[PDB]
Short mmCIF file of C-alpha atoms in Angstrom, two decimals:
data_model
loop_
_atom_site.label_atom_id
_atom_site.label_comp_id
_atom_site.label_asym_id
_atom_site.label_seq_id
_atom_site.Cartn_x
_atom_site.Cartn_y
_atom_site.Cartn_z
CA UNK V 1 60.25 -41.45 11.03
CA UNK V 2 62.05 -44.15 13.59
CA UNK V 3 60.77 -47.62 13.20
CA UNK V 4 60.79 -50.21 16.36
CA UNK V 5 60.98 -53.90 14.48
CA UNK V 6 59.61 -56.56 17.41
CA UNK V 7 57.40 -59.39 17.56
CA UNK V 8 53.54 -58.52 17.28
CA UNK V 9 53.93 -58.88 21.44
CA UNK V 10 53.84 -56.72 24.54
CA UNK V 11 57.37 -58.38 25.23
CA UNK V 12 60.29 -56.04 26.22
CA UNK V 13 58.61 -53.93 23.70
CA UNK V 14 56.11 -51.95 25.84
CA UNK V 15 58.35 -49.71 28.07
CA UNK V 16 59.98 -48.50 24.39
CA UNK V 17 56.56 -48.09 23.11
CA UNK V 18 55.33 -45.99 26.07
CA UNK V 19 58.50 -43.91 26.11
CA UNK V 20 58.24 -43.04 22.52
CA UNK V 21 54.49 -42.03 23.48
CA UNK V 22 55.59 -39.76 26.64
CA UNK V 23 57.81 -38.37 24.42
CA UNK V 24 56.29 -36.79 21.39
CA UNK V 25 58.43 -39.71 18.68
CA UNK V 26 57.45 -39.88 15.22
CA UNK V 27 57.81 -43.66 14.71
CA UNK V 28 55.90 -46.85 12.91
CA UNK V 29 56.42 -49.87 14.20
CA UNK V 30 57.49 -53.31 11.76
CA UNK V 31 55.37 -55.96 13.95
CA UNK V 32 57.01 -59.48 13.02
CA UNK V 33 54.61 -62.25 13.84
CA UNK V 34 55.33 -66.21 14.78
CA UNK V 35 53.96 -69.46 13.99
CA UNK V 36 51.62 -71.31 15.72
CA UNK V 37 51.38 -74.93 16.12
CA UNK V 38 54.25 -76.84 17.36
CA UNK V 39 56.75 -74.88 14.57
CA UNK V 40 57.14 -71.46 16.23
CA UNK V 41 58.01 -70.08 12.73
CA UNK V 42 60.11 -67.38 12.80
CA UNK V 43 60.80 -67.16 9.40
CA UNK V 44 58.98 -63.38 9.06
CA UNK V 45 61.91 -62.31 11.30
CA UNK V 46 64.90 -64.87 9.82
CA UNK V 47 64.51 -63.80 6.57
CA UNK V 48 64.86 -60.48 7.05
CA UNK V 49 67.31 -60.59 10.31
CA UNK V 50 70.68 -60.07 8.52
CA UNK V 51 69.12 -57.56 5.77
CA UNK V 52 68.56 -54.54 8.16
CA UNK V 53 71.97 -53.43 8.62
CA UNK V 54 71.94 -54.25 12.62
CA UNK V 55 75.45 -54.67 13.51
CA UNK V 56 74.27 -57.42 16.35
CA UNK V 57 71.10 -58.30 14.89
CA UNK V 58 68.46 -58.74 17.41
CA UNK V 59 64.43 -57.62 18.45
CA UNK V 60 63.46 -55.47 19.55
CA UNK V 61 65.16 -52.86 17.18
CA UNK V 62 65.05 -48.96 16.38
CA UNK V 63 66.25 -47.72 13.29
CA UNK V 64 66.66 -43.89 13.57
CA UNK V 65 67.94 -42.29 10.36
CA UNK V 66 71.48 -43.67 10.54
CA UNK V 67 71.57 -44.64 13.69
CA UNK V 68 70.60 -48.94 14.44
CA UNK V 69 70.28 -49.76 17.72
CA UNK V 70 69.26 -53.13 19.79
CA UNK V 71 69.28 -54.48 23.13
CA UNK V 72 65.86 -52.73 25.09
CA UNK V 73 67.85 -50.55 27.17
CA UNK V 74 70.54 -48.60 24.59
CA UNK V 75 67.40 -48.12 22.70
CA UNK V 76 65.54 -46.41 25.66
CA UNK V 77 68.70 -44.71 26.54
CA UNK V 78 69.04 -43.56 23.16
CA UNK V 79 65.68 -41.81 23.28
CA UNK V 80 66.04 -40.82 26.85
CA UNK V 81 69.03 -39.51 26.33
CA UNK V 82 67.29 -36.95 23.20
CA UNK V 83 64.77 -35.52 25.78
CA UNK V 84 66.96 -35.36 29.23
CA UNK V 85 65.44 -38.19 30.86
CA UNK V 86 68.32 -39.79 31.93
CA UNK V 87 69.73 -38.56 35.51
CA UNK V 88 71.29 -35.17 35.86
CA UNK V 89 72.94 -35.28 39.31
CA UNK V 90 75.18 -38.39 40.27
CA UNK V 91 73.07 -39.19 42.61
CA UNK V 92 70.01 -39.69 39.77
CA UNK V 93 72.23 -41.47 37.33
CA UNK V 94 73.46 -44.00 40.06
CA UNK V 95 69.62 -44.91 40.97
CA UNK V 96 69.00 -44.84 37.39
CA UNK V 97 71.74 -47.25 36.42
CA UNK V 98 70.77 -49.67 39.63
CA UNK V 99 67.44 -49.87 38.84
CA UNK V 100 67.89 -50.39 34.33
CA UNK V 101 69.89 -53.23 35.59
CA UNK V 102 67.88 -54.58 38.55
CA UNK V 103 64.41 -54.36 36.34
CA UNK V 104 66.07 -56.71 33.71
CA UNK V 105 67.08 -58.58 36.13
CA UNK V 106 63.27 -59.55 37.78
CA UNK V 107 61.94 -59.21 34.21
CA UNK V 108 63.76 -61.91 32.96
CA UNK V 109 63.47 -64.12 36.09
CA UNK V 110 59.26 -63.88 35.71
CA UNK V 111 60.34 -64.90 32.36
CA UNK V 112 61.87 -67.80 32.88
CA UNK V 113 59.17 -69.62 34.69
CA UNK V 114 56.57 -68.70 31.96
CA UNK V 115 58.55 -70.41 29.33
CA UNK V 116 59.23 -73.68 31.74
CA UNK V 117 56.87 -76.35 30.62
CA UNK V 118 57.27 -77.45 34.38
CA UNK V 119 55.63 -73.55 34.87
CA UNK V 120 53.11 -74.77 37.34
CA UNK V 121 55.73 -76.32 40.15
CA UNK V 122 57.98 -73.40 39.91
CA UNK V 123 55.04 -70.80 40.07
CA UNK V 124 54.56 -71.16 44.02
CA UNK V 125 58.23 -70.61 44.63
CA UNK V 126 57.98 -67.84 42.74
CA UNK V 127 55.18 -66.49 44.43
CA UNK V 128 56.88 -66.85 47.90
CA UNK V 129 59.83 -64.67 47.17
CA UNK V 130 57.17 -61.72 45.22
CA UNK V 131 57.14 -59.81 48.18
CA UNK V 132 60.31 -59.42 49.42
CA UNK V 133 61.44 -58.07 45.80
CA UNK V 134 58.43 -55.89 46.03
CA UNK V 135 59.08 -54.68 48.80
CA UNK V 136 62.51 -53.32 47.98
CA UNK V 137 61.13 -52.02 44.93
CA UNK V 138 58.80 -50.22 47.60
CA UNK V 139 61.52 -48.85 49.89
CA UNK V 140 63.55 -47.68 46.89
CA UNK V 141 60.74 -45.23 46.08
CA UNK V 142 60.44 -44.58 49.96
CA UNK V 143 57.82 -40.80 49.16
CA UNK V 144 59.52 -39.27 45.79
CA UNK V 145 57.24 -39.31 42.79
CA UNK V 146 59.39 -41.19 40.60
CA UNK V 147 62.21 -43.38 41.16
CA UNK V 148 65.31 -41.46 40.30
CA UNK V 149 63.91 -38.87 42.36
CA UNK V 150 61.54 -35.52 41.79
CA UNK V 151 61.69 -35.63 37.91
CA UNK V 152 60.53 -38.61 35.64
CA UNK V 153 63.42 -40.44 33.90
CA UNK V 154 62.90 -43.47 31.15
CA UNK V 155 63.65 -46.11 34.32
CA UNK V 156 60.26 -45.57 35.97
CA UNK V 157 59.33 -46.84 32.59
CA UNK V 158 60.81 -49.99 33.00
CA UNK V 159 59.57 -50.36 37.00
CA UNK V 160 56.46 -49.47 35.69
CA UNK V 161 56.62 -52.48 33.35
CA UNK V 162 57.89 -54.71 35.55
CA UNK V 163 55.02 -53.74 38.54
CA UNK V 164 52.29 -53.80 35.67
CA UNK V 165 53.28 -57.11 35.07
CA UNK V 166 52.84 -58.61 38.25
CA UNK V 167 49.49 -57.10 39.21
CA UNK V 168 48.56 -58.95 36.05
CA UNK V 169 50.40 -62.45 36.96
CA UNK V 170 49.11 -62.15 40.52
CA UNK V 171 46.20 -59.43 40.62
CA UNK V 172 46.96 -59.12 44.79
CA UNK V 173 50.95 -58.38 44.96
CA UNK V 174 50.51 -54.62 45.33
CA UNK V 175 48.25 -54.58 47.85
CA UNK V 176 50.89 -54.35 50.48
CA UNK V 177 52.41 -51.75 48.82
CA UNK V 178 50.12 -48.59 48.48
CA UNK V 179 53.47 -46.75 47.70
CA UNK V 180 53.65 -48.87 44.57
CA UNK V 181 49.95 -48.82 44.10
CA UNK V 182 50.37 -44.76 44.03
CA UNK V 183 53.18 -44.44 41.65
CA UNK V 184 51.34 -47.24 39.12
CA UNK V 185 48.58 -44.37 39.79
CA UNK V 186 50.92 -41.54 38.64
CA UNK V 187 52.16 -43.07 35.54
CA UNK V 188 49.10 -43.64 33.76
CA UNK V 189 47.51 -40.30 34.86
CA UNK V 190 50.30 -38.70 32.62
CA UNK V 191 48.31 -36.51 29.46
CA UNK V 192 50.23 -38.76 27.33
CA UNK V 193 50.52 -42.35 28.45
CA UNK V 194 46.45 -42.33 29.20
CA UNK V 195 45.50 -40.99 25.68
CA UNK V 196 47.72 -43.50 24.64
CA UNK V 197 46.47 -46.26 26.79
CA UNK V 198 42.86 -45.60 25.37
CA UNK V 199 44.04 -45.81 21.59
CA UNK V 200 44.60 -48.65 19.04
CA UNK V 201 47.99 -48.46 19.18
CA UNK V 202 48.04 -50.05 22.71
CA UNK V 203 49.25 -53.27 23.13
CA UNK V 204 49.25 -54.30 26.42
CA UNK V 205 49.08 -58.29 25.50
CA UNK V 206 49.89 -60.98 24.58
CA UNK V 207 52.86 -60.82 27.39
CA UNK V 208 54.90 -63.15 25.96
CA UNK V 209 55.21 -65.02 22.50
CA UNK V 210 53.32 -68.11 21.57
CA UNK V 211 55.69 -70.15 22.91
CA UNK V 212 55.07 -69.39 26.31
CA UNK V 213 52.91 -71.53 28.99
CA UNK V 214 51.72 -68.76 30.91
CA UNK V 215 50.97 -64.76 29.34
CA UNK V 216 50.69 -66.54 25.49
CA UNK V 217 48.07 -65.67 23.06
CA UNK T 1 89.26 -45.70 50.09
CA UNK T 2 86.07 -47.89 47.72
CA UNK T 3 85.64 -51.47 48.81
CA UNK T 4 84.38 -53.90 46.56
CA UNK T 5 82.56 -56.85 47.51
CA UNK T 6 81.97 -60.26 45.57
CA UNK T 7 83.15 -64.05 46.03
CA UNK T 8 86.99 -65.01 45.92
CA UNK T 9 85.86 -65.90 42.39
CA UNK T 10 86.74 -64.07 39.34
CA UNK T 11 82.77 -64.25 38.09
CA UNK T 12 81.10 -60.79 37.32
CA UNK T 13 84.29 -58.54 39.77
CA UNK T 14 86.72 -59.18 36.50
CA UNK T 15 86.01 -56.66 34.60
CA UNK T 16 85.31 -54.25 37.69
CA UNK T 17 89.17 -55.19 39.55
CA UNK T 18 90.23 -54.37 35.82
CA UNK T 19 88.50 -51.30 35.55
CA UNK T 20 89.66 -50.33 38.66
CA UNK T 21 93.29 -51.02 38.16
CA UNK T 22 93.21 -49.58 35.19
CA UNK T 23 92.20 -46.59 36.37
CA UNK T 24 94.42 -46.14 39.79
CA UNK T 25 91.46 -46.45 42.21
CA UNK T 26 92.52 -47.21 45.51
CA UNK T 27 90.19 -49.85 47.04
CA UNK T 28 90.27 -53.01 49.20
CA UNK T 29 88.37 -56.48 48.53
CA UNK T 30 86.20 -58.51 50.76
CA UNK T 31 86.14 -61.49 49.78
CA UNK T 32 83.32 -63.63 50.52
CA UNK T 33 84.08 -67.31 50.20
CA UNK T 34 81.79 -70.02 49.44
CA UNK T 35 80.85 -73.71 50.75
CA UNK T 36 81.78 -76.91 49.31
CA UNK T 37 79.86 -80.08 49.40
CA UNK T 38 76.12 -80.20 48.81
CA UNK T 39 75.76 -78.18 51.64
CA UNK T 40 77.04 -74.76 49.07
CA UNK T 41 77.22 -72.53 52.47
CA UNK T 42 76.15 -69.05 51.21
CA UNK T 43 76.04 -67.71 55.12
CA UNK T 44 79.20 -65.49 55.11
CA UNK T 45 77.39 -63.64 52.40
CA UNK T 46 73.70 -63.87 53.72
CA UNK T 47 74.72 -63.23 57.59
CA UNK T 48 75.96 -59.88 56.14
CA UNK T 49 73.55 -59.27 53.07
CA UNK T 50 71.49 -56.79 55.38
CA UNK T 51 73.99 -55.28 57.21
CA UNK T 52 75.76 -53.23 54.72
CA UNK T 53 73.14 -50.37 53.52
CA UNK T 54 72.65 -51.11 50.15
CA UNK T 55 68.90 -51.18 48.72
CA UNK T 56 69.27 -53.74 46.38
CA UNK T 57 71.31 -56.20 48.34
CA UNK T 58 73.71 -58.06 45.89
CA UNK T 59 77.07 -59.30 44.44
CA UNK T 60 79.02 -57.82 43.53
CA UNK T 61 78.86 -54.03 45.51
CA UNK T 62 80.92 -51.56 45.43
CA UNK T 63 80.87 -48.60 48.35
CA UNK T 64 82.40 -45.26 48.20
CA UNK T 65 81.90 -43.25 50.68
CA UNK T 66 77.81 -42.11 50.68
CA UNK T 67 77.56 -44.15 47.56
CA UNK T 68 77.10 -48.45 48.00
CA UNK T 69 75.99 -49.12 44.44
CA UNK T 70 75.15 -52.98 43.36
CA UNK T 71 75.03 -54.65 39.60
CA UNK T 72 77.91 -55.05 37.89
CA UNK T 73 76.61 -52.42 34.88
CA UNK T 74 76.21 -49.59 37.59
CA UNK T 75 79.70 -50.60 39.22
CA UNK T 76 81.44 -49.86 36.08
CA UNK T 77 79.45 -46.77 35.02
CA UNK T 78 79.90 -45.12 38.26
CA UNK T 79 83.90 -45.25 38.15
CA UNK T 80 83.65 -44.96 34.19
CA UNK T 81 81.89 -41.66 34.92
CA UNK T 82 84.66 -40.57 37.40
CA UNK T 83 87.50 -40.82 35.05
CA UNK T 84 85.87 -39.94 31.36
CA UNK T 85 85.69 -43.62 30.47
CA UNK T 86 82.48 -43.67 28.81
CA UNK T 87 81.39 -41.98 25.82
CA UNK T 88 81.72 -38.37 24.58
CA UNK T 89 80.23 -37.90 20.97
CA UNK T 90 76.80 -39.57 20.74
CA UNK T 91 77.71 -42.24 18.42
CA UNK T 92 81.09 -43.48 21.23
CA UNK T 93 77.86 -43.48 23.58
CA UNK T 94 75.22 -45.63 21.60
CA UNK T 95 78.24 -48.31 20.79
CA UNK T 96 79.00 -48.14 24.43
CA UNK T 97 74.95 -49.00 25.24
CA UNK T 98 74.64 -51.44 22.97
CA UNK T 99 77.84 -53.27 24.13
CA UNK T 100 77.63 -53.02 27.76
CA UNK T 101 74.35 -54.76 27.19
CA UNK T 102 75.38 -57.35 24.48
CA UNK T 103 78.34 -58.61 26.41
CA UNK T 104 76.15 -59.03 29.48
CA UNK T 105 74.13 -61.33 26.99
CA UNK T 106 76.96 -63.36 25.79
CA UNK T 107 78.12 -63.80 29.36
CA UNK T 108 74.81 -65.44 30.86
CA UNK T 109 74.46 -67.96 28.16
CA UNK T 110 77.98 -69.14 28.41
CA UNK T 111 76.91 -68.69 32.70
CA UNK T 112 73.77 -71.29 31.92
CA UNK T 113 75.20 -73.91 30.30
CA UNK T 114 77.88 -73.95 32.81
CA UNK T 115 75.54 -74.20 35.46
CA UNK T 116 73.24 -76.76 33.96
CA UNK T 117 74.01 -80.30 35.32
CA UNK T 118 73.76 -81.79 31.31
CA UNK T 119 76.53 -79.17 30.50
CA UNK T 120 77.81 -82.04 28.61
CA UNK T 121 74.74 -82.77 25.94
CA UNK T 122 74.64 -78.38 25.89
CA UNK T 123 78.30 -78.03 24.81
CA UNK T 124 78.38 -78.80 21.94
CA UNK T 125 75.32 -76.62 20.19
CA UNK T 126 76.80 -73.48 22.02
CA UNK T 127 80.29 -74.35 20.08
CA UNK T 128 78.15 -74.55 17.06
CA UNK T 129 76.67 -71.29 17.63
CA UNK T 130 79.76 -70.13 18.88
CA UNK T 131 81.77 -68.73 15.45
CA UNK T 132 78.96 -66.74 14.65
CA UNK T 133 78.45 -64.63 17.68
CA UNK T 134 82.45 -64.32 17.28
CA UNK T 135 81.99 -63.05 14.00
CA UNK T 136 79.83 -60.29 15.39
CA UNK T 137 82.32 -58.95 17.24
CA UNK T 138 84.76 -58.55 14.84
CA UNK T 139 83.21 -56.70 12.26
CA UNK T 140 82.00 -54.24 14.89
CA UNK T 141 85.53 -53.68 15.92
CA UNK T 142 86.52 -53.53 12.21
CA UNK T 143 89.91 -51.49 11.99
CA UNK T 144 89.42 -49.91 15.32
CA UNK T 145 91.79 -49.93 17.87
CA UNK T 146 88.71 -50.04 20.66
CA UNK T 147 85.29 -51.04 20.46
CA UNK T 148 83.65 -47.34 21.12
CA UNK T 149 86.18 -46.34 18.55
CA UNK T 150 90.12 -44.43 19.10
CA UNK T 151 89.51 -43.91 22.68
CA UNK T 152 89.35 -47.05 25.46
CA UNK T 153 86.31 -46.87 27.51
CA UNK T 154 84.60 -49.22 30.07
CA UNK T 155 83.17 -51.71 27.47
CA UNK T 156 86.45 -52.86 26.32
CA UNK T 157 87.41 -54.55 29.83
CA UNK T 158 83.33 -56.16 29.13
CA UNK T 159 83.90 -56.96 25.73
CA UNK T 160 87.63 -58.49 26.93
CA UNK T 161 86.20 -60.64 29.81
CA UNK T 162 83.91 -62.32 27.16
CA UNK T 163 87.06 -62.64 24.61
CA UNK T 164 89.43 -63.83 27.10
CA UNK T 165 86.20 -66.54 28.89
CA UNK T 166 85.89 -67.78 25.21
CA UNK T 167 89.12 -68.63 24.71
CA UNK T 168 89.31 -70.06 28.14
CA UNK T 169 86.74 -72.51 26.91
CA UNK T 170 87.34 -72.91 23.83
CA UNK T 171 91.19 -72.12 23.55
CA UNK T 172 90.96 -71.78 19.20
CA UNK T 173 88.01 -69.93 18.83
CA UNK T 174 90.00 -66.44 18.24
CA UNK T 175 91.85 -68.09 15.99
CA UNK T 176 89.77 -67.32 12.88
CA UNK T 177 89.66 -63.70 13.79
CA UNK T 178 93.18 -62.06 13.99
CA UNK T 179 91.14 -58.66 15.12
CA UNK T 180 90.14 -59.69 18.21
CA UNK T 181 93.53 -61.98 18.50
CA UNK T 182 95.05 -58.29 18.03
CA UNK T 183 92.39 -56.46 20.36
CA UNK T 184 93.37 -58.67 23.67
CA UNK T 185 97.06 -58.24 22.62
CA UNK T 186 96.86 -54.21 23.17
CA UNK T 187 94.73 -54.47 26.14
CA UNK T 188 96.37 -56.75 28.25
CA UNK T 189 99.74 -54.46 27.07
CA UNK T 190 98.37 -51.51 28.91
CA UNK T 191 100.90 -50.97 31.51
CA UNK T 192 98.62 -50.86 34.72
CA UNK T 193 97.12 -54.11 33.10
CA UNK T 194 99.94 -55.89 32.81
CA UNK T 195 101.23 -54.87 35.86
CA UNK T 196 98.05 -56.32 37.36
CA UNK T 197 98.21 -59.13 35.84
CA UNK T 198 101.79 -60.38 37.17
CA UNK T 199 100.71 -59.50 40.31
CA UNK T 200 99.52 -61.35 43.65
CA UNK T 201 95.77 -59.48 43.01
CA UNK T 202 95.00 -61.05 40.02
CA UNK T 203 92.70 -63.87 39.97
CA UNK T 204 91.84 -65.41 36.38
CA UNK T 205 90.40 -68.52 38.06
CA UNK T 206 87.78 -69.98 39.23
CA UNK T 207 85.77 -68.52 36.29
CA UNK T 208 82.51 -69.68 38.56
CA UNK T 209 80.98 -70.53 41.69
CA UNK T 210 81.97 -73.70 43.34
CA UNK T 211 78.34 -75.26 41.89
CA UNK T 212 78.94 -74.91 38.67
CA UNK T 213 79.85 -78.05 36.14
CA UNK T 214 82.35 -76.01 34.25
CA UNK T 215 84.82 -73.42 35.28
CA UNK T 216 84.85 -74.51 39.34
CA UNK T 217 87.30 -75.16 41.64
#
């Protein structure tokens, strides 16, 4: 079946994982792990990096017959894509395409603070500006179900992640937002992401890698 | 007719004025101009940033008609869509995914060095580091005459912009790979290119924001 290669991490992993889940994929996953200590070793992954074939080598990774992907989102695309979960009217493909975008965007900017040994000054900034993104993420969804619009496509995935997140960074951010709190609500009432989420296969931490001040393990 | 919206910059809009060019598109700029000093007045944009309709408010935006879509990705995709510019067989798409995410990659960590105040002590690692990404894109390209394969599509103006930045920077590194010297050769001969590019629209430079250590003005 496919195999996802990525660190032994929730990482930019766990949206991919979930969508493989919600979507019936045969896969296995090849879970690289890292050194501790102050050499991060990365060796499992190094020594094997330019072996697989991956024309821009790179984790996470799917590897689907003859097909190698990387980056997160062409593989989620690339599944999405094999069950109709990306938009069907322009209007659902623009909101789609906003939002892969605009979720990379916030993840990585939560991610830069929790790899910033100077984590602790930057964190209250941070936390000041949480609610106005929130809050756009909020009026975006305005009453539709899901975020591209009455049907479920692999972005409210990603928001999912990136909301899921935050609740865990600060436990309070939703609050304001029982839109938000709803559609959190929604996603893991589906059949398949719940008997998922109570299996062995979930891996909902460590957040980031070892080398991280804040959501390491 | 669309309007486009960004800083009198060439920044992320390069690929998009391309794109549009490229593909006839009749649309105006505004142009939203930027402070000097240490004072880096962002109030042209900010005094406007809620005024304009668009849910994720941003730079650059594009608006036609109903539609005011925001991230550069999304941009692209939308007037890719409208004129058969991205994929058609499944493999075109997958090397269009992993690309349009790749080059967005390659273009923030050239972006962060540029913006970090040491750009000097950073320099010379990303140089190091520099040949090898390179090499990636070459062999992907292989005998090709564009990056999805015989037919251009939107990724070439992103995987250009990259080229073209590099070599910019570092005015030999294309040297060592007659492929891509070859690949900017046919693109910027495309007639609406060309014709672009000798005109008074074109802006090559600044390459970023008045803040930024490198590529300024």
């Amino acid at each position: 079946p496919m195999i996802l290669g990525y660190w032994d991490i929730r990482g930019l992993a766990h949206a991919i994982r979930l969508l493989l889940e919600y979507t019936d994929s045969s896969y296995e996953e090849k879970k690289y792990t890292m050194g501790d200590a102050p050499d991060y070793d990365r060796s499992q992954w190094l020594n094997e990096k330019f072996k697989l074939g991956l024309d821009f080598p790179n984790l996470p990774y799917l590897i689907d017959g003859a097909h190698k992907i990387t980056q997160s989102n062409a593989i989620l695309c690339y599944i999405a894509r094999k069950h109709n979960l990306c938009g069907e009217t322009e209007e659902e493909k623009i909101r789609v395409d906003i939002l892969e975008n605009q979720t990379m965007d916030n993840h990585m900017q939560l991610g830069m603070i929790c790899y910033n040994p100077e984590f602790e000054k930057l964190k209250p900034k941070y936390l000041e500006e949480l609610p106005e993104k929130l809050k756009l993420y909020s009026e975006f969804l305005g009453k539709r179900p899901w975020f591209a619009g009455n049907k479920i496509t692999f972005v409210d995935f990603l928001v999912y992640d990136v909301l899921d997140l935050h609740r865990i960074f600060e436990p309070k951010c939703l609050d304001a937002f029982p839109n938000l709190k709803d559609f959190i609500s929604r996603f893991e009432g589906l059949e398949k992401i719940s008997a998922y989420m109570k299996s062995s296969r979930f891996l909902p931490r460590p957040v980031f890698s070892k080398m991280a001040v804040w959501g390491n393990k």
